[PDB]
Copies of this chain bind each other. A is one copy, B any other.
Amino acid sequence: VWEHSRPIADDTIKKTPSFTTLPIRINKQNDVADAATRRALRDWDYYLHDALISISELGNLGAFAYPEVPPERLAIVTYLTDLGILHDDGYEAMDMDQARTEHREFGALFDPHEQLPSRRGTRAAKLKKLVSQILLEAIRIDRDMGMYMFDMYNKGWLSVAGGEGKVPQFKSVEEYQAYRRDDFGIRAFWPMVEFGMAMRLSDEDKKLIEPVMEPIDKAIIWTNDYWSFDREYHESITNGSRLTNVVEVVRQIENKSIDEAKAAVRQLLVNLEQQYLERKRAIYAQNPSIPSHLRKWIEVVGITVAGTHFWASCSPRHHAWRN
């Protein structure tokens, strides 16, 4: 099932505060991911002229989020991830109305199909060439999957994140998670993995893997929340950037200190990882002839949680705010 990734040794993992229980692997082409991050940084500055994104001491976020992706596709998905981070950081700092407008106008640039002329502010107008250029690169590698991925970057993320009204006050984990799925862009992320692995999941495929994706989606999102809480909380105080984080929700609705809320979220995460293993075991026990691409998918999502956990445990993006 493994082709493009290599395992991180226990001896390396123990040097970090990682606590994931799932297997940690990294794309073998980490240098390609780093080059893609440098390209995104250069292009952002070239087109906008105005950061702590995927690069870290442990390796590039793209090499951990896309472990089983060949290098030409890794360069695309890493670049799109970094472009998304750079955009999202600005979005979190803007007034809700203007933040929403920037999200929607940015998302319209990713539509792979012809659109009638529309008005767009300076920021989206300056990024239009950037987005069309990367779409052409993706299409040249894989037309149908490239167009699908770009369509979902909008439909799964930019068109929905932020909701449509005032900034909500989260009074339940259920309501938090509905908002956070949109805000995290989870419905854009899995299509990027599909593009990276050159497999389009069928509707029937998605139905079969739903029991695995249930704990996986919560785990991947709440793993970011766990590791990014300190920096998000600091930023919210220091400049008003919006704090969207399950640790914060637990702090509030359970009257818990930061450390008590973190301890609770850690237990949720480890339990979700073990639940994923049980849901996955059940799929194997009940599908003796599972197609190879679906076997690959259900295995890859587990290492994707593990790898993004591992990266987040040390990344400058989450930890450089206080040395």
The reply to whether the CB of A210 lies closer than 8 angstroms to some CB of chain B is: yes
Q: Is the beta-carbon distance between A214 and B282 smaller than 8 angstroms?
A: no
The reply to whether the CB of A238 lies closer than 8 angstroms to some CB of chain B is: no
A-B pairs, 8 with minimum CB distance: A255-B282, A171-B210, A211-B253, A172-B214, A254-B278, A255-B285, A172-B210, A171-B211
Among A208, A253, A285, the most chain B Cβ lie within 10 Å of the Cβ of A253
Point out the residues of chain B lying under 8 angstroms from A213, CB to CB: 172
Q: List 13 A-B contacts (CB under 8 A).
A: A171-B208, A171-B210, A172-B210, A172-B211, A173-B214, A175-B210, A211-B253, A211-B254, A252-B282, A253-B279, A254-B279, A254-B282, A255-B282
Point out the residues of chain B lying under 8 angstroms from A253, CB to CB: 211, 279, 282
Given A255-B286, A285-B255, are A214 and B174 also a contact pair (CB < 8 Å)? Answer: yes
The reply to whether the CB of A207 lies closer than 8 angstroms to some CB of chain B is: yes
Bound-state CA distance A173–B174 (Å) is 13
Point out the residues of chain B lying under 8 angstroms from A200, CB to CB: none
Bound-state CA distance A253–B215 (Å) is 12
A285 to chain B, nearest CB (A): 5
The reply to whether the CB of A129 lies closer than 8 angstroms to some CB of chain B is: no
Point out the residues of chain B lying under 8 angstroms from A282, CB to CB: 252-255
User: Which chain B residue shows the least CB distance to A206?
Assistant: B171
Bound-state CA distance A210–B278 (Å) is 31
Bound-state CA distance A179–B38 (Å) is 47
User: Which chain B residue shows the least CB distance to A207?
Assistant: B171
The reply to whether the CB of A281 lies closer than 8 angstroms to some CB of chain B is: yes
Bound-state CA distance A252–B174 (Å) is 24
Bound-state CA distance A220–B211 (Å) is 23
Among A210, A211, A213, A286, the most chain B Cβ lie within 10 Å of the Cβ of A211
Question: Which of A255-305 touch B at CB < 8 Å?
Answer: 255, 275, 278-279, 281-282, 285-286
Bound-state CA distance A175–B169 (Å) is 24
Bound-state CA distance A128–B175 (Å) is 39
Question: Which of A171-217 touch B at CB < 8 Å?
Answer: 171-175, 207-208, 210-211, 213-214
Bound-state CA distance A111–B278 (Å) is 45
